[PDB]
Amino acid sequence: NIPLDNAGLVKKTILVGINQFGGGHFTDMSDPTATTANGAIGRKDKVSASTLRLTFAEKA
């Protein structure tokens, strides 16, 4: 089984959003493939959260 551990693996932790306006990066709001608009959690690779950390990685 794959062990779960953030220490030693991740170096930067990002806290995003207080409301659904900031929470749209982790749901179907930022998911192009998602069809619903009920705030369902979309695929992590397609939401803007993945792009948020992607531009962070290349810049830093």
Side-chain angles (χ1 to χ4, degrees):
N1 291 324
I2 312 298
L4 177 59
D5 53 329
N6 297 21
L9 178 55
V10 298
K11 315 302 296 181
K12 295 300 177 299
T13 303
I14 311 299
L15 275 294
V16 178
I18 199 184
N19 283 10
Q20 54 277 9
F21 299 92
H25 302 275
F26 304 92
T27 177
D28 53 353
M29 298 292 101
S30 57
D31 197 332
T33 63
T35 62
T36 61
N38 304 89
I41 302 301
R43 308 199 307 178
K44 297 182 179 180
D45 64 329
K46 304 302 297 179
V47 296
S48 62
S50 62
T51 64
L52 174 60
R53 79 165 190 175
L54 183 60
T55 178
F56 209 147
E58 49 91 6
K59 287 297 182 179

mmCIF file of all heavy atoms in Angstrom:
data_model
loop_
_atom_site.group_PDB
_atom_site.id
_atom_site.type_symbol
_atom_site.label_atom_id
_atom_site.label_comp_id
_atom_site.label_asym_id
_atom_site.label_seq_id
_atom_site.Cartn_x
_atom_site.Cartn_y
_atom_site.Cartn_z
ATOM 1 N N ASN A 1 0.830 -1.194 0.000
ATOM 2 C CA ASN A 1 0.000 0.000 0.000
ATOM 3 C C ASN A 1 0.869 1.250 0.000
ATOM 4 O O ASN A 1 1.946 1.286 0.601
ATOM 5 C CB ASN A 1 -0.931 0.012 1.213
ATOM 6 C CG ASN A 1 -2.008 -1.050 1.129
ATOM 7 O OD1 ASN A 1 -2.523 -1.345 0.052
ATOM 8 N ND2 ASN A 1 -2.355 -1.631 2.272
ATOM 9 N N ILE A 2 0.389 2.285 -0.683
ATOM 10 C CA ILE A 2 1.133 3.535 -0.802
ATOM 11 C C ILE A 2 1.003 4.314 0.502
ATOM 12 O O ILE A 2 -0.111 4.701 0.883
ATOM 13 C CB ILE A 2 0.637 4.370 -1.993
ATOM 14 C CG1 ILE A 2 0.529 3.501 -3.246
ATOM 15 C CG2 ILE A 2 1.568 5.545 -2.239
ATOM 16 C CD1 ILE A 2 1.846 2.923 -3.703
ATOM 17 N N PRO A 3 2.100 4.563 1.213
ATOM 18 C CA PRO A 3 2.013 5.362 2.438
ATOM 19 C C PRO A 3 1.698 6.815 2.132
ATOM 20 O O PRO A 3 2.087 7.358 1.095
ATOM 21 C CB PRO A 3 3.407 5.212 3.058
ATOM 22 C CG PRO A 3 4.298 4.941 1.896
ATOM 23 C CD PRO A 3 3.478 4.128 0.931
ATOM 24 N N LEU A 4 0.991 7.451 3.061
ATOM 25 C CA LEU A 4 0.612 8.852 2.941
ATOM 26 C C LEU A 4 1.495 9.684 3.861
ATOM 27 O O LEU A 4 1.488 9.484 5.081
ATOM 28 C CB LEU A 4 -0.864 9.049 3.287
ATOM 29 C CG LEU A 4 -1.369 10.492 3.276
ATOM 30 C CD1 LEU A 4 -1.165 11.114 1.907
ATOM 31 C CD2 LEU A 4 -2.831 10.552 3.684
ATOM 32 N N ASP A 5 2.247 10.614 3.278
ATOM 33 C CA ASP A 5 3.145 11.460 4.053
ATOM 34 C C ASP A 5 3.462 12.712 3.252
ATOM 35 O O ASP A 5 3.884 12.619 2.094
ATOM 36 C CB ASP A 5 4.433 10.712 4.415
ATOM 37 C CG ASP A 5 5.112 10.100 3.205
ATOM 38 O OD1 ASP A 5 4.399 9.722 2.253
ATOM 39 O OD2 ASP A 5 6.356 9.999 3.206
ATOM 40 N N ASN A 6 3.256 13.875 3.866
ATOM 41 C CA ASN A 6 3.587 15.141 3.225
ATOM 42 C C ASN A 6 4.990 15.619 3.568
ATOM 43 O O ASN A 6 5.602 16.337 2.769
ATOM 44 C CB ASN A 6 2.572 16.216 3.620
ATOM 45 C CG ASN A 6 1.168 15.891 3.150
ATOM 46 O OD1 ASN A 6 0.846 14.736 2.876
ATOM 47 N ND2 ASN A 6 0.326 16.912 3.054
ATOM 48 N N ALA A 7 5.508 15.240 4.733
ATOM 49 C CA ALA A 7 6.851 15.644 5.125
ATOM 50 C C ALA A 7 7.885 15.024 4.195
ATOM 51 O O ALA A 7 7.818 13.837 3.866
ATOM 52 C CB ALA A 7 7.129 15.238 6.571
ATOM 53 N N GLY A 8 8.848 15.842 3.766
ATOM 54 C CA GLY A 8 9.883 15.404 2.857
ATOM 55 C C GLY A 8 9.478 15.333 1.402
ATOM 56 O O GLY A 8 10.355 15.343 0.529
ATOM 57 N N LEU A 9 8.181 15.258 1.105
ATOM 58 C CA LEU A 9 7.712 15.180 -0.274
ATOM 59 C C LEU A 9 7.362 16.560 -0.825
ATOM 60 O O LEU A 9 7.934 17.000 -1.827
ATOM 61 C CB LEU A 9 6.504 14.241 -0.364
ATOM 62 C CG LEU A 9 5.874 14.094 -1.749
ATOM 63 C CD1 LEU A 9 6.915 13.657 -2.765
ATOM 64 C CD2 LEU A 9 4.719 13.109 -1.708
ATOM 65 N N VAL A 10 6.430 17.250 -0.180
ATOM 66 C CA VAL A 10 6.002 18.573 -0.618
ATOM 67 C C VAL A 10 6.789 19.626 0.147
ATOM 68 O O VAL A 10 7.102 19.456 1.332
ATOM 69 C CB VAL A 10 4.484 18.752 -0.426
ATOM 70 C CG1 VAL A 10 3.725 17.749 -1.281
ATOM 71 C CG2 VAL A 10 4.100 18.606 1.038
ATOM 72 N N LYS A 11 7.130 20.717 -0.542
ATOM 73 C CA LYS A 11 7.897 21.797 0.058
ATOM 74 C C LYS A 11 7.100 23.076 0.255
ATOM 75 O O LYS A 11 7.482 23.898 1.094
ATOM 76 C CB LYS A 11 9.133 22.112 -0.798
ATOM 77 C CG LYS A 11 9.898 20.880 -1.260
ATOM 78 C CD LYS A 11 10.362 20.033 -0.085
ATOM 79 C CE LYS A 11 11.366 20.779 0.778
ATOM 80 N NZ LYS A 11 11.838 19.946 1.918
ATOM 81 N N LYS A 12 6.010 23.264 -0.486
ATOM 82 C CA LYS A 12 5.172 24.448 -0.368
ATOM 83 C C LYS A 12 3.717 24.023 -0.246
ATOM 84 O O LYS A 12 3.238 23.205 -1.038
ATOM 85 C CB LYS A 12 5.354 25.380 -1.572
ATOM 86 C CG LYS A 12 6.749 25.973 -1.686
ATOM 87 C CD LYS A 12 7.094 26.797 -0.457
ATOM 88 C CE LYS A 12 8.514 27.335 -0.534
ATOM 89 N NZ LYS A 12 9.515 26.235 -0.609
ATOM 90 N N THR A 13 3.022 24.580 0.741
ATOM 91 C CA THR A 13 1.606 24.321 0.961
ATOM 92 C C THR A 13 0.828 25.607 0.728
ATOM 93 O O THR A 13 1.184 26.659 1.269
ATOM 94 C CB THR A 13 1.354 23.798 2.377
ATOM 95 O OG1 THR A 13 2.129 22.613 2.595
ATOM 96 C CG2 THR A 13 -0.120 23.474 2.570
ATOM 97 N N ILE A 14 -0.230 25.522 -0.073
ATOM 98 C CA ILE A 14 -1.009 26.685 -0.483
ATOM 99 C C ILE A 14 -2.416 26.555 0.082
ATOM 100 O O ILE A 14 -3.091 25.545 -0.147
ATOM 101 C CB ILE A 14 -1.048 26.830 -2.014
ATOM 102 C CG1 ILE A 14 0.362 26.728 -2.597
ATOM 103 C CG2 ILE A 14 -1.684 28.152 -2.404
ATOM 104 C CD1 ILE A 14 1.305 27.800 -2.099
ATOM 105 N N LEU A 15 -2.852 27.577 0.812
ATOM 106 C CA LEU A 15 -4.209 27.653 1.339
ATOM 107 C C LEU A 15 -5.005 28.610 0.461
ATOM 108 O O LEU A 15 -4.641 29.784 0.330
ATOM 109 C CB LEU A 15 -4.207 28.124 2.793
ATOM 110 C CG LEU A 15 -3.998 27.091 3.905
ATOM 111 C CD1 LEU A 15 -5.168 26.126 3.958
ATOM 112 C CD2 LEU A 15 -2.687 26.334 3.742
ATOM 113 N N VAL A 16 -6.086 28.112 -0.137
ATOM 114 C CA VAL A 16 -6.816 28.840 -1.168
ATOM 115 C C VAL A 16 -8.268 29.004 -0.743
ATOM 116 O O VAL A 16 -8.938 28.024 -0.401
ATOM 117 C CB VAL A 16 -6.734 28.122 -2.529
ATOM 118 C CG1 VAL A 16 -7.538 28.879 -3.575
ATOM 119 C CG2 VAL A 16 -5.287 27.974 -2.965
ATOM 120 N N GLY A 17 -8.746 30.246 -0.765
ATOM 121 C CA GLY A 17 -10.167 30.527 -0.722
ATOM 122 C C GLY A 17 -10.843 30.462 0.631
ATOM 123 O O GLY A 17 -10.536 29.600 1.459
ATOM 124 N N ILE A 18 -11.776 31.384 0.856
ATOM 125 C CA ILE A 18 -12.668 31.321 2.004
ATOM 126 C C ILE A 18 -14.096 30.970 1.602
ATOM 127 O O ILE A 18 -14.831 30.404 2.427
ATOM 128 C CB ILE A 18 -12.647 32.641 2.804
ATOM 129 C CG1 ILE A 18 -13.190 32.427 4.216
ATOM 130 C CG2 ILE A 18 -13.461 33.714 2.100
ATOM 131 C CD1 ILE A 18 -13.278 33.699 5.032
ATOM 132 N N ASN A 19 -14.505 31.262 0.368
ATOM 133 C CA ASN A 19 -15.840 30.981 -0.133
ATOM 134 C C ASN A 19 -15.730 30.230 -1.453
ATOM 135 O O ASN A 19 -14.633 29.934 -1.937
ATOM 136 C CB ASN A 19 -16.654 32.270 -0.310
ATOM 137 C CG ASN A 19 -17.181 32.810 1.001
ATOM 138 O OD1 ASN A 19 -16.797 32.349 2.075
ATOM 139 N ND2 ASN A 19 -18.069 33.795 0.923
ATOM 140 N N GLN A 20 -16.888 29.929 -2.044
ATOM 141 C CA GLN A 20 -16.915 29.224 -3.319
ATOM 142 C C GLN A 20 -16.249 30.021 -4.432
ATOM 143 O O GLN A 20 -15.838 29.432 -5.439
ATOM 144 C CB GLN A 20 -18.357 28.883 -3.705
ATOM 145 C CG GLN A 20 -19.314 30.070 -3.721
ATOM 146 C CD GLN A 20 -19.856 30.414 -2.344
ATOM 147 O OE1 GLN A 20 -19.404 29.877 -1.333
ATOM 148 N NE2 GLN A 20 -20.830 31.315 -2.302
ATOM 149 N N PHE A 21 -16.141 31.344 -4.281
ATOM 150 C CA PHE A 21 -15.396 32.136 -5.254
ATOM 151 C C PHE A 21 -13.928 31.734 -5.274
ATOM 152 O O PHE A 21 -13.322 31.612 -6.346
ATOM 153 C CB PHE A 21 -15.543 33.624 -4.944
ATOM 154 C CG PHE A 21 -16.959 34.119 -5.003
ATOM 155 C CD1 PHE A 21 -17.748 34.139 -3.864
ATOM 156 C CD2 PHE A 21 -17.502 34.563 -6.196
ATOM 157 C CE1 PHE A 21 -19.052 34.594 -3.916
ATOM 158 C CE2 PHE A 21 -18.805 35.018 -6.254
ATOM 159 C CZ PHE A 21 -19.581 35.033 -5.112
ATOM 160 N N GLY A 22 -13.336 31.528 -4.100
ATOM 161 C CA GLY A 22 -11.989 31.005 -4.018
ATOM 162 C C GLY A 22 -11.969 29.493 -4.087
ATOM 163 O O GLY A 22 -10.946 28.890 -4.424
ATOM 164 N N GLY A 23 -13.104 28.873 -3.772
ATOM 165 C CA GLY A 23 -13.250 27.436 -3.836
ATOM 166 C C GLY A 23 -13.576 26.880 -5.201
ATOM 167 O O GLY A 23 -13.669 25.659 -5.357
ATOM 168 N N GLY A 24 -13.755 27.744 -6.202
ATOM 169 C CA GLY A 24 -14.040 27.275 -7.545
ATOM 170 C C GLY A 24 -12.877 26.570 -8.208
ATOM 171 O O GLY A 24 -13.084 25.832 -9.177
ATOM 172 N N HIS A 25 -11.659 26.778 -7.707
ATOM 173 C CA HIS A 25 -10.484 26.126 -8.271
ATOM 174 C C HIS A 25 -10.420 24.640 -7.950
ATOM 175 O O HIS A 25 -9.618 23.929 -8.564
ATOM 176 C CB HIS A 25 -9.214 26.813 -7.770
ATOM 177 C CG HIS A 25 -9.153 28.275 -8.083
ATOM 178 N ND1 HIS A 25 -8.692 28.760 -9.287
ATOM 179 C CD2 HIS A 25 -9.494 29.359 -7.347
ATOM 180 C CE1 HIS A 25 -8.752 30.080 -9.281
ATOM 181 N NE2 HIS A 25 -9.235 30.469 -8.114
ATOM 182 N N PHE A 26 -11.232 24.155 -7.011
ATOM 183 C CA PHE A 26 -11.204 22.755 -6.607
ATOM 184 C C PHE A 26 -12.498 22.019 -6.932
ATOM 185 O O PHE A 26 -12.721 20.923 -6.406
ATOM 186 C CB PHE A 26 -10.910 22.639 -5.107
ATOM 187 C CG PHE A 26 -9.638 23.313 -4.683
ATOM 188 C CD1 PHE A 26 -9.645 24.629 -4.253
ATOM 189 C CD2 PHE A 26 -8.435 22.629 -4.709
ATOM 190 C CE1 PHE A 26 -8.477 25.250 -3.861
ATOM 191 C CE2 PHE A 26 -7.263 23.245 -4.317
ATOM 192 C CZ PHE A 26 -7.283 24.558 -3.893
ATOM 193 N N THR A 27 -13.353 22.583 -7.781
ATOM 194 C CA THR A 27 -14.645 21.982 -8.078
ATOM 195 C C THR A 27 -14.902 22.086 -9.578
ATOM 196 O O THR A 27 -14.009 22.418 -10.363
ATOM 197 C CB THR A 27 -15.761 22.647 -7.262
ATOM 198 O OG1 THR A 27 -17.022 22.075 -7.625
ATOM 199 C CG2 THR A 27 -15.796 24.140 -7.533
ATOM 200 N N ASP A 28 -16.144 21.798 -9.972
ATOM 201 C CA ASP A 28 -16.535 21.803 -11.376
ATOM 202 C C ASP A 28 -16.550 23.196 -11.990
ATOM 203 O O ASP A 28 -16.674 23.309 -13.215
ATOM 204 C CB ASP A 28 -17.913 21.157 -11.535
ATOM 205 C CG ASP A 28 -18.954 21.777 -10.625
ATOM 206 O OD1 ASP A 28 -18.585 22.623 -9.783
ATOM 207 O OD2 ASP A 28 -20.144 21.419 -10.751
ATOM 208 N N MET A 29 -16.442 24.251 -11.178
ATOM 209 C CA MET A 29 -16.437 25.605 -11.721
ATOM 210 C C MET A 29 -15.251 25.821 -12.652
ATOM 211 O O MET A 29 -15.383 26.463 -13.702
ATOM 212 C CB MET A 29 -16.419 26.627 -10.583
ATOM 213 C CG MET A 29 -17.630 26.572 -9.659
ATOM 214 S SD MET A 29 -19.170 27.085 -10.448
ATOM 215 C CE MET A 29 -19.925 25.501 -10.805
ATOM 216 N N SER A 30 -14.084 25.295 -12.286
ATOM 217 C CA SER A 30 -12.876 25.428 -13.086
ATOM 218 C C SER A 30 -12.594 24.197 -13.938
ATOM 219 O O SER A 30 -11.501 24.083 -14.500
ATOM 220 C CB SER A 30 -11.678 25.720 -12.180
ATOM 221 O OG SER A 30 -11.519 24.708 -11.203
ATOM 222 N N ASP A 31 -13.552 23.275 -14.045
ATOM 223 C CA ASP A 31 -13.351 22.051 -14.805
ATOM 224 C C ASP A 31 -14.034 22.184 -16.158
ATOM 225 O O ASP A 31 -15.273 22.179 -16.217
ATOM 226 C CB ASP A 31 -13.908 20.849 -14.042
ATOM 227 C CG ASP A 31 -13.383 19.525 -14.567
ATOM 228 O OD1 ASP A 31 -13.054 19.438 -15.769
ATOM 229 O OD2 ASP A 31 -13.301 18.565 -13.773
ATOM 230 N N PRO A 32 -13.287 22.315 -17.257
ATOM 231 C CA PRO A 32 -13.936 22.393 -18.577
ATOM 232 C C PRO A 32 -14.737 21.154 -18.937
ATOM 233 O O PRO A 32 -15.779 21.268 -19.594
ATOM 234 C CB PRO A 32 -12.754 22.596 -19.537
ATOM 235 C CG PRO A 32 -11.649 23.133 -18.682
ATOM 236 C CD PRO A 32 -11.827 22.483 -17.346
ATOM 237 N N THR A 33 -14.282 19.969 -18.525
ATOM 238 C CA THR A 33 -14.967 18.735 -18.899
ATOM 239 C C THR A 33 -16.256 18.529 -18.115
ATOM 240 O O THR A 33 -17.175 17.867 -18.609
ATOM 241 C CB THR A 33 -14.041 17.535 -18.696
ATOM 242 O OG1 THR A 33 -13.715 17.410 -17.305
ATOM 243 C CG2 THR A 33 -12.760 17.711 -19.497
ATOM 244 N N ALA A 34 -16.343 19.072 -16.904
ATOM 245 C CA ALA A 34 -17.530 18.885 -16.082
ATOM 246 C C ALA A 34 -18.735 19.578 -16.708
ATOM 247 O O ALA A 34 -18.624 20.674 -17.263
ATOM 248 C CB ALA A 34 -17.290 19.420 -14.673
ATOM 249 N N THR A 35 -19.892 18.925 -16.617
ATOM 250 C CA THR A 35 -21.128 19.460 -17.173
ATOM 251 C C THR A 35 -22.034 20.091 -16.129
ATOM 252 O O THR A 35 -22.761 21.037 -16.448
ATOM 253 C CB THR A 35 -21.905 18.356 -17.900
ATOM 254 O OG1 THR A 35 -22.261 17.327 -16.968
ATOM 255 C CG2 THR A 35 -21.059 17.754 -19.011
ATOM 256 N N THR A 36 -22.008 19.597 -14.894
ATOM 257 C CA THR A 36 -22.865 20.133 -13.851
ATOM 258 C C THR A 36 -22.297 21.438 -13.300
ATOM 259 O O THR A 36 -21.121 21.765 -13.481
ATOM 260 C CB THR A 36 -23.034 19.120 -12.718
ATOM 261 O OG1 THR A 36 -21.757 18.834 -12.133
ATOM 262 C CG2 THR A 36 -23.643 17.831 -13.244
ATOM 263 N N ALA A 37 -23.161 22.190 -12.618
ATOM 264 C CA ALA A 37 -22.786 23.447 -11.985
ATOM 265 C C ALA A 37 -23.259 23.492 -10.537
ATOM 266 O O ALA A 37 -23.537 24.567 -9.999
ATOM 267 C CB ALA A 37 -23.336 24.641 -12.765
ATOM 268 N N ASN A 38 -23.352 22.330 -9.895
ATOM 269 C CA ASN A 38 -23.840 22.220 -8.528
ATOM 270 C C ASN A 38 -22.715 22.225 -7.502
ATOM 271 O O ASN A 38 -22.947 21.869 -6.342
ATOM 272 C CB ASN A 38 -24.683 20.954 -8.371
ATOM 273 C CG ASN A 38 -25.837 20.899 -9.349
ATOM 274 O OD1 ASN A 38 -25.696 20.403 -10.466
ATOM 275 N ND2 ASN A 38 -26.989 21.412 -8.933
ATOM 276 N N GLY A 39 -21.508 22.618 -7.899
ATOM 277 C CA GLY A 39 -20.389 22.619 -6.982
ATOM 278 C C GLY A 39 -19.753 21.269 -6.754
ATOM 279 O O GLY A 39 -19.010 21.105 -5.781
ATOM 280 N N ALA A 40 -20.015 20.297 -7.623
ATOM 281 C CA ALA A 40 -19.404 18.985 -7.488
ATOM 282 C C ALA A 40 -17.899 19.068 -7.718
ATOM 283 O O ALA A 40 -17.409 19.900 -8.485
ATOM 284 C CB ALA A 40 -20.030 17.998 -8.472
ATOM 285 N N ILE A 41 -17.166 18.191 -7.040
ATOM 286 C CA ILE A 41 -15.710 18.177 -7.133
ATOM 287 C C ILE A 41 -15.308 17.572 -8.472
ATOM 288 O O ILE A 41 -15.557 16.389 -8.731
ATOM 289 C CB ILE A 41 -15.089 17.397 -5.967
ATOM 290 C CG1 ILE A 41 -15.524 18.003 -4.632
ATOM 291 C CG2 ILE A 41 -13.573 17.389 -6.081
ATOM 292 C CD1 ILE A 41 -15.129 19.450 -4.464
ATOM 293 N N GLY A 42 -14.684 18.382 -9.324
ATOM 294 C CA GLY A 42 -14.224 17.915 -10.613
ATOM 295 C C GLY A 42 -12.898 17.189 -10.524
ATOM 296 O O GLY A 42 -12.315 17.008 -9.454
ATOM 297 N N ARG A 43 -12.418 16.756 -11.687
ATOM 298 C CA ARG A 43 -11.137 16.067 -11.754
ATOM 299 C C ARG A 43 -10.005 17.021 -11.397
ATOM 300 O O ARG A 43 -9.964 18.163 -11.863
ATOM 301 C CB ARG A 43 -10.918 15.482 -13.147
ATOM 302 C CG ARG A 43 -12.068 14.626 -13.649
ATOM 303 C CD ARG A 43 -11.628 13.723 -14.792
ATOM 304 N NE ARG A 43 -10.973 14.462 -15.864
ATOM 305 C CZ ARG A 43 -10.469 13.904 -16.956
ATOM 306 N NH1 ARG A 43 -10.531 12.597 -17.155
ATOM 307 N NH2 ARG A 43 -9.887 14.675 -17.869
ATOM 308 N N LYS A 44 -9.079 16.540 -10.566
ATOM 309 C CA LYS A 44 -8.010 17.401 -10.067
ATOM 310 C C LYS A 44 -7.080 17.864 -11.181
ATOM 311 O O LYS A 44 -6.529 18.968 -11.105
ATOM 312 C CB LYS A 44 -7.214 16.673 -8.984
ATOM 313 C CG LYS A 44 -8.023 16.322 -7.749
ATOM 314 C CD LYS A 44 -7.159 15.642 -6.700
ATOM 315 C CE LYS A 44 -7.961 15.319 -5.450
ATOM 316 N NZ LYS A 44 -7.131 14.645 -4.412
ATOM 317 N N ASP A 45 -6.885 17.043 -12.215
ATOM 318 C CA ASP A 45 -5.985 17.419 -13.298
ATOM 319 C C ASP A 45 -6.567 18.504 -14.193
ATOM 320 O O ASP A 45 -5.803 19.232 -14.836
ATOM 321 C CB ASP A 45 -5.632 16.191 -14.140
ATOM 322 C CG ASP A 45 -6.839 15.597 -14.836
ATOM 323 O OD1 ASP A 45 -7.953 15.699 -14.284
ATOM 324 O OD2 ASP A 45 -6.674 15.027 -15.935
ATOM 325 N N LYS A 46 -7.893 18.633 -14.250
ATOM 326 C CA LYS A 46 -8.529 19.590 -15.146
ATOM 327 C C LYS A 46 -8.891 20.908 -14.477
ATOM 328 O O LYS A 46 -9.071 21.909 -15.179
ATOM 329 C CB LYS A 46 -9.795 18.981 -15.758
ATOM 330 C CG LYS A 46 -9.560 17.665 -16.478
ATOM 331 C CD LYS A 46 -8.533 17.816 -17.590
ATOM 332 C CE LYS A 46 -9.021 18.768 -18.669
ATOM 333 N NZ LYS A 46 -8.010 18.946 -19.747
ATOM 334 N N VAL A 47 -9.007 20.937 -13.148
ATOM 335 C CA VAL A 47 -9.365 22.177 -12.471
ATOM 336 C C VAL A 47 -8.189 23.148 -12.497
ATOM 337 O O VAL A 47 -7.036 22.779 -12.752
ATOM 338 C CB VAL A 47 -9.825 21.903 -11.030
ATOM 339 C CG1 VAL A 47 -11.094 21.066 -11.028
ATOM 340 C CG2 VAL A 47 -8.723 21.216 -10.243
ATOM 341 N N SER A 48 -8.494 24.418 -12.228
ATOM 342 C CA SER A 48 -7.470 25.457 -12.232
ATOM 343 C C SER A 48 -6.484 25.322 -11.081
ATOM 344 O O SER A 48 -5.434 25.971 -11.113
ATOM 345 C CB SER A 48 -8.124 26.839 -12.192
ATOM 346 O OG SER A 48 -8.882 27.011 -11.008
ATOM 347 N N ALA A 49 -6.797 24.509 -10.068
ATOM 348 C CA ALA A 49 -5.854 24.297 -8.974
ATOM 349 C C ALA A 49 -4.574 23.640 -9.471
ATOM 350 O O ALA A 49 -3.473 23.999 -9.036
ATOM 351 C CB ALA A 49 -6.501 23.453 -7.876
ATOM 352 N N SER A 50 -4.698 22.667 -10.376
ATOM 353 C CA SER A 50 -3.515 22.035 -10.950
ATOM 354 C C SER A 50 -2.678 23.043 -11.726
ATOM 355 O O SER A 50 -1.445 23.041 -11.633
ATOM 356 C CB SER A 50 -3.926 20.871 -11.851
ATOM 357 O OG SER A 50 -4.724 21.322 -12.933
ATOM 358 N N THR A 51 -3.331 23.911 -12.502
ATOM 359 C CA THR A 51 -2.603 24.958 -13.209
ATOM 360 C C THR A 51 -2.011 25.977 -12.245
ATOM 361 O O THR A 51 -0.960 26.560 -12.532
ATOM 362 C CB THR A 51 -3.517 25.654 -14.215
ATOM 363 O OG1 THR A 51 -4.581 26.314 -13.519
ATOM 364 C CG2 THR A 51 -4.106 24.641 -15.186
ATOM 365 N N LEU A 52 -2.672 26.209 -11.108
ATOM 366 C CA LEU A 52 -2.146 27.150 -10.125
ATOM 367 C C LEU A 52 -0.802 26.685 -9.579
ATOM 368 O O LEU A 52 0.133 27.482 -9.449
ATOM 369 C CB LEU A 52 -3.149 27.339 -8.988
ATOM 370 C CG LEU A 52 -2.681 28.200 -7.812
ATOM 371 C CD1 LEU A 52 -2.345 29.609 -8.275
ATOM 372 C CD2 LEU A 52 -3.731 28.228 -6.713
ATOM 373 N N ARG A 53 -0.687 25.398 -9.249
ATOM 374 C CA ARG A 53 0.594 24.863 -8.810
ATOM 375 C C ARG A 53 1.552 24.631 -9.971
ATOM 376 O O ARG A 53 2.768 24.617 -9.756
ATOM 377 C CB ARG A 53 0.394 23.557 -8.038
ATOM 378 C CG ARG A 53 0.159 22.339 -8.913
ATOM 379 C CD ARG A 53 0.335 21.054 -8.123
ATOM 380 N NE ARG A 53 0.336 19.882 -8.990
ATOM 381 C CZ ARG A 53 0.560 18.644 -8.572
ATOM 382 N NH1 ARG A 53 0.804 18.378 -7.299
ATOM 383 N NH2 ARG A 53 0.540 17.649 -9.453
ATOM 384 N N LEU A 54 1.033 24.444 -11.186
ATOM 385 C CA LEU A 54 1.902 24.222 -12.338
ATOM 386 C C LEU A 54 2.719 25.466 -12.657
ATOM 387 O O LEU A 54 3.933 25.384 -12.877
ATOM 388 C CB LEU A 54 1.071 23.795 -13.547
ATOM 389 C CG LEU A 54 1.861 23.455 -14.812
ATOM 390 C CD1 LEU A 54 2.828 22.314 -14.546
ATOM 391 C CD2 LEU A 54 0.922 23.112 -15.955
ATOM 392 N N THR A 55 2.070 26.633 -12.687
ATOM 393 C CA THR A 55 2.807 27.869 -12.919
ATOM 394 C C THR A 55 3.704 28.211 -11.737
ATOM 395 O O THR A 55 4.737 28.866 -11.913
ATOM 396 C CB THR A 55 1.844 29.020 -13.215
ATOM 397 O OG1 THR A 55 2.589 30.232 -13.401
ATOM 398 C CG2 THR A 55 0.858 29.210 -12.074
ATOM 399 N N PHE A 56 3.325 27.782 -10.531
ATOM 400 C CA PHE A 56 4.186 27.976 -9.370
ATOM 401 C C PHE A 56 5.483 27.188 -9.517
ATOM 402 O O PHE A 56 6.567 27.697 -9.214
ATOM 403 C CB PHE A 56 3.440 27.563 -8.100
ATOM 404 C CG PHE A 56 3.876 28.296 -6.860
ATOM 405 C CD1 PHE A 56 2.962 28.586 -5.862
ATOM 406 C CD2 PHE A 56 5.191 28.694 -6.688
ATOM 407 C CE1 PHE A 56 3.350 29.256 -4.718
ATOM 408 C CE2 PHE A 56 5.586 29.363 -5.547
ATOM 409 C CZ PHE A 56 4.664 29.647 -4.561
ATOM 410 N N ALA A 57 5.387 25.944 -9.993
ATOM 411 C CA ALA A 57 6.567 25.092 -10.098
ATOM 412 C C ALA A 57 7.564 25.639 -11.113
ATOM 413 O O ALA A 57 8.768 25.703 -10.842
ATOM 414 C CB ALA A 57 6.148 23.669 -10.468
ATOM 415 N N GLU A 58 7.080 26.037 -12.293
ATOM 416 C CA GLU A 58 7.989 26.493 -13.339
ATOM 417 C C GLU A 58 8.600 27.850 -13.010
ATOM 418 O O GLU A 58 9.766 28.097 -13.336
ATOM 419 C CB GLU A 58 7.265 26.535 -14.686
ATOM 420 C CG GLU A 58 5.921 27.244 -14.669
ATOM 421 C CD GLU A 58 6.030 28.724 -14.979
ATOM 422 O OE1 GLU A 58 7.141 29.186 -15.314
ATOM 423 O OE2 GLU A 58 5.001 29.427 -14.892
ATOM 424 N N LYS A 59 7.837 28.739 -12.369
ATOM 425 C CA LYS A 59 8.377 30.050 -12.020
ATOM 426 C C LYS A 59 9.387 29.949 -10.884
ATOM 427 O O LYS A 59 10.461 30.559 -10.945
ATOM 428 C CB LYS A 59 7.246 31.006 -11.646
ATOM 429 C CG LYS A 59 6.417 31.487 -12.824
ATOM 430 C CD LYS A 59 7.259 32.288 -13.802
ATOM 431 C CE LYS A 59 6.419 32.805 -14.958
ATOM 432 N NZ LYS A 59 7.227 33.606 -15.918
ATOM 433 N N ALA A 60 9.065 29.185 -9.841
ATOM 434 C CA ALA A 60 9.957 29.050 -8.696
ATOM 435 C C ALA A 60 11.059 28.021 -8.915
ATOM 436 O O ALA A 60 12.016 27.992 -8.134
ATOM 437 C CB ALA A 60 9.156 28.686 -7.444
#
